[model samples]
Target chain A: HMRCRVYYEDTDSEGVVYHANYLKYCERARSEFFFKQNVLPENEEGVFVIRSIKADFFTPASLGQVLEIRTQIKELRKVFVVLFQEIYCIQNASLEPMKPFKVFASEIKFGFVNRSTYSPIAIPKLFKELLNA
Target chain B: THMRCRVYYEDTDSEGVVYHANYLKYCERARSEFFFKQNVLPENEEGVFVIRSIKADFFTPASLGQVLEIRTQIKELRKVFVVLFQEIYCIQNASLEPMKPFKVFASEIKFGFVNRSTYSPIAIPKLFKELLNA
Candidate 1:
């Protein structure tokens, strides 16, 4: 779970968060998972690149609202990983608790590839185990 | 149906290829041009078209200094929303010949019509239907 506050830069003239930024926030959430453990997601040999994505927007998130990004690995494979990420608008302080409203969701497929060659490469064992566990 | 864009510094990441999310931006640009060229405002008294969902596939990476041509066609036009198919082709060396056999990116996006103020579902205006037909 990652919490981030929406800022003016994150919004568009429509007064809602830009659609593309939701994907960026999901990428940041994935990186935060690796950073929290002090592990680099990539090394000199290879890096992970997004292969595809299917995203849906249910509600618009506006500036001054706090959003929570939640991620779950749907599939972990030899060369790629599929992740499901959902963004929810956190409720403001209130006398009664309120459940967060889901604003956006996406399923991203990441492929490990050789940095120089940009060819498919097997995910490193350490990173695989970290994500698996 | 077509829009050309150049890959710039802001569009690329440390990996040297254009970032995945930026492709979505490119699609929006093409859509905007499609409306502008026809002198039609997608958003009017009726409402605006807002993206509801997108399914994107990235086949190949595009590097800097390359111009990309994006193609957009309405796949399905419904009463309340429309589905568009968009593809991005990379143009290298400014050549009209040797166009890549395969597109670098493709997406199927669905946009819904909604009231400007309340954001509720609304019928697409008559002008938009004509634009899609013509």
Candidate 2:
């Protein structure tokens, strides 16, 4: 899980987070998932590229609200992975206990490719263990 | 009919390929251009369109210094919502033949019409409806 705060830069004229920003937030969480394990998702071994995404927007998240992203791999394969991620609006600030309400959800398919040649590549052995484990 | 956008540094990710989210941004700009070209305002007394959902498929990766064309068509339109089918085609540095550009991305976006102030469902305005109809 990753936690972030909504700022003026994240919202649009609708007074809520911009739709595209949710994708960016999720991308950050996906990167952090690897970072926590001392691995970089982008490396000489491989780079992740989005193949497809299906997104649903629920309740709007307002400015100043804290958001949390929870991600889980729905499928793990040799060359690609499918992830299910959810975004929640944290009801309270950092000082208080947190209550989360779902705001957005997405299922993304990411494929791996050689960082230099951009050719398809199997998941690196180390990263595969982290994801499969 | 649409807009041609360049893939700038800001639109790319760590791998130097255009970020997935930036495709949505390009689609929105193409949608706005539909009204802008006709000298019509997308926001009016009736309401504005907000995306309810999006289903996107990426076929090719685009890098910096390339140009992409956004082609949009209204797939479905009702009193309270509309569905747009948008495709992004590579223009410069594309692997395909120069005369036949390859589609890099495609998405179907559902937009709901609602009052800007209250966010309640509202009928599509005449001016906007006419522009879309044409």
Candidate 3:
């Protein structure tokens, strides 16, 4: 999970969030999720590269708003793990019935490849065991 | 004050419309102009303001060789902050009225001043605020 405070620079003249920057925000959240899972691309022997991503923007997040991004592992395949993510705006401080101001949902597909050969590799034994649990 | 910039070849993408990232560059130029109008050189300022948020909407995409005008209006002002609403207008082709123009795209950006050393939010400097008002 990631929490971001909306600053003025994040918005456009229409007092809404810029479209391209939405991808940037999602990228940040994805990085944090990897960090929590003890999967650091820079530290690993094989790197997991984003093959493709698909996102749907339901509403716009504006200035002076706080957004929460929740990430979950949706599918774990032999060579990839599909992450299901969502960004929800916090309506209030309390946790009771939190209203999501804007929702952005996306699926990030990542594949592992050998560092030198750049060829697909079987899912690491450690990662596969972790996912199975 | 307003600035007119042409839609150059570098600004368009394969879709023939301005790529989304390029608009941020355009907005950055406009902010530079705003500072220039107030006699503040962006480079001279030890600290720079970074974009914290941007929400933009695309109505009609501006095509190649089109002359677009960026009209900037100050929406709100505070001790260390400025809010601006800007529009990109497509100049009507020959034999058309300029006022009945087509709106291509619009962007709204909010900027905040932060301490360069700490990267923490700070109030806008007095000189810059005066320049903005002037």
Candidate 4:
């Protein structure tokens, strides 16, 4: 899980996070999760590319709120990976812990490409090892 | 044909390039502007269209202050429904080459259309098909 703070820049005129920006926040969280798994997103082996995104916007997240994005690897294949993420808005900034308000659910499909050719490539051995080990 | 748009500060992030998500907005705007104005439902009893889904890929980011050309095309035309294909590119380097774009930042935006009020898929109206085919 990755923690993000909603800044004024992240909000729109209605003071809620814009619909499209949710994709950006999810992308950042997924990148961090890969880093924590000992996988380098930027390497000679491969670079990541998004093939598709199927997301449902249920509620809106507002400014000055702490958002939590939980990432789960739905499917890991030879060439691509699918991530299931739940984006929550913390309702009470203070509680036993802040209460989470469910906002969005996003399923993103992505694959790795050769750094030079930008063509699909098998998942790096090192990255696969960290994930499947 | 494509429409021209400017890259504003709001479109960029700390990276100084237009953030990837903004590309979707640009493509959506392009398609809305490409539609047939006469047959468009104006939010009365019948609702306008709603997007069913979108498929897009990001190649690179355009730097600040650059002018972008957004192209919108129809991939499939079904009565009461239309599938759109869109791409956005910067004209700085590849503008002169009518055959190619300098660098396509976002391409392959495939979106589905549905009626707004009933939330069901509708057939393509005649004027819409003519405009889309043209």
Candidate 5:
């Protein structure tokens, strides 16, 4: 799980989180999840593409607040992965067992594709086992 | 005062109309212009007033090449804050009697000023207050 603090730039005039910004948060979490798994495409010609995304905003987050974004690989296939991600308000920043605020939830469907052809590619062998394990 | 602009391809998405998120950018630009005319630049010494809340009501989505006017007005005035009401209007120029001229899409936003260093709310600047009064 990755944590981020909300800033004024991420909010609207109602002192709450703006609706569209939830998408931005999901994108950031997806990139971080790939980075952590060491499955990011390194080739200059390779790129990851998003087939689609579904998000549901439950509650509003405000500025100067700290939130945690949790990510998990729900489904893994040869060419794609379905990610379950959630954003929760962090009750404590330290090592204490804190409660999560459960602000937003989303599911991202992403596929690995050949950048040159924009077609799906088989998941790398190393990643396939690592992710499943 | 209000100005008109046409929605371009850059403003639309796979949904075939203006993406819901893009409306924020449009409204921000329109408000920027309104402040610029009043000599209230966002980068002033007083610090930029960040958006605190936005209550939007989406009507028909503006399509590509559709000309729309964005109008702004001061809805509330406080010692240290102001609320701005803005609207998007689709002009229906007809020669018939009793022409209906009104806003097609509208949204309301509230803003507050804060000291950048202290992160505390502050009063509106003198220049902006005078401009608002004018």
Candidate 6:
């Protein structure tokens, strides 16, 4: 779980967060998840890119709202990982006192590729182990 | 359904390619112009149009100063939902071609017609419908 504050810069003229930004929030959440497990890399010979995504928005999160991004492992294979994530507005002061209203859901597929050649590569062992564990 | 946009420094991260989020911006600008050219108000007396879902595949990266030609078309039309297909081709951020030095920022985005006040699904406005028909 990751907690994100909706800054003014993140909003639009309507005073609501723009739709595309939820992807950014969830991305930061995923990175935070990796950082928490100590599986994130600073540099590697390859880069992980999103292959595709099926995203749905149920409601909107507004500026000044603290949003919670929760992610779960869905599928993993030799070179790809699929993640299930949801976005919600949280009223709690901090970490998990548990009042949340969901506003978005997404299934994102990511894969690894050789940076220079762009050929598919196996996901790093560390993250594979992290997912396996 | 056309709009040309220039890649800006703000639209990119250190990755040297336009962020996927930026594609939404490009598609949206094109879509809004679609409404404008026909003199349609997405949110008029009845309701507003909002995205219901989106599916996108980032085929490749786009570099700095790259300009894009975005094309929009209505693939499906219904009372509650409309599926719009947007294709991005690089034209000048100079010599921008989808297969040339860049790749298409592909997308199939869906928009919902909803009551502005209640947010319930509604039939698409007549002007938009006519735009689609014509």
Looking at candidate 4 chain A, the ten consecutive residues that score lowest on lDDT are A91-100
- What's the TM-score of each model vs. the native? 0.93, 0.91, 0.50, 0.64, 0.52, 0.88
- Residue B74 accuracy (lDDT) in model 6: 81
Clashes (backbone N, CA, C under 3 Å), per candidate, total 0, 0, 25, 7, 9, 3
Task: Estimate every model's Cα lDDT from 0 to 1.
Answer: 0.87, 0.86, 0.67, 0.69, 0.68, 0.80
Clash pairs (backbone) in predicted model 2: none
- Over the stretch B1-134, how does candidate 5's per-residue lDDT look in tens digits? 57777678887765456665566567778877766876657546755565655566655556676676788788997878887888887553323234345554666667677776665778878777767655
**Model 3 spans with C-alpha error above 4 angstroms:** A1-133, B43-45, B92-99
Fnat per model, in the order given?
A: 0.94, 0.94, 0.03, 0.46, 0.03, 0.89
Q: How high is the lDDT of residue A1 in model 1?
A: 92
Q: Top model by lDDT, which number?
A: 1
Model 2, which residues run further than 4 Å from truth? Answer: A92-99, B94-99
In model 1, the runs with Cα more than 4 Å from the true position are: A92-99, B94-102
DockQ of each: 0.88, 0.86, 0.05, 0.35, 0.06, 0.79
Q: Which structure among the candidates has the greatest TM-score?
A: 1
Error of 4 at A10 (Å): 0.1
Cα lDDT tens digits, model 3, B41-72, are 75335555545454455555566777677777
> B33-110 in candidate 2: lDDT tens per residue?
888887876787657787789999998777887889999888998978888899999887634446557788999999
TM-score of chain A considered alone, across all candidate predictions: 0.93, 0.89, 0.76, 0.87, 0.81, 0.88
lDDT of 1 by residue, A1-133 (tens): 9999888999998888999999989989999999999987888799998888999998888887888999999999999999999999985433245667999999999999988888998889988998998
Root-mean-square deviation of each candidate, in angstroms? 2.3, 2.7, 14.3, 6.1, 11.2, 3.1
**Could you list the chain B TM-scores for each candidate?**
0.90, 0.91, 0.83, 0.76, 0.84, 0.87
Cα lDDT for residue B42, model 3?
51
lDDT for model 4, please: 0.69
- In candidate 3, how many Å is residue A127 off? 30
- Candidate order by decreasing TM-score: 1, 2, 6, 4, 5, 3
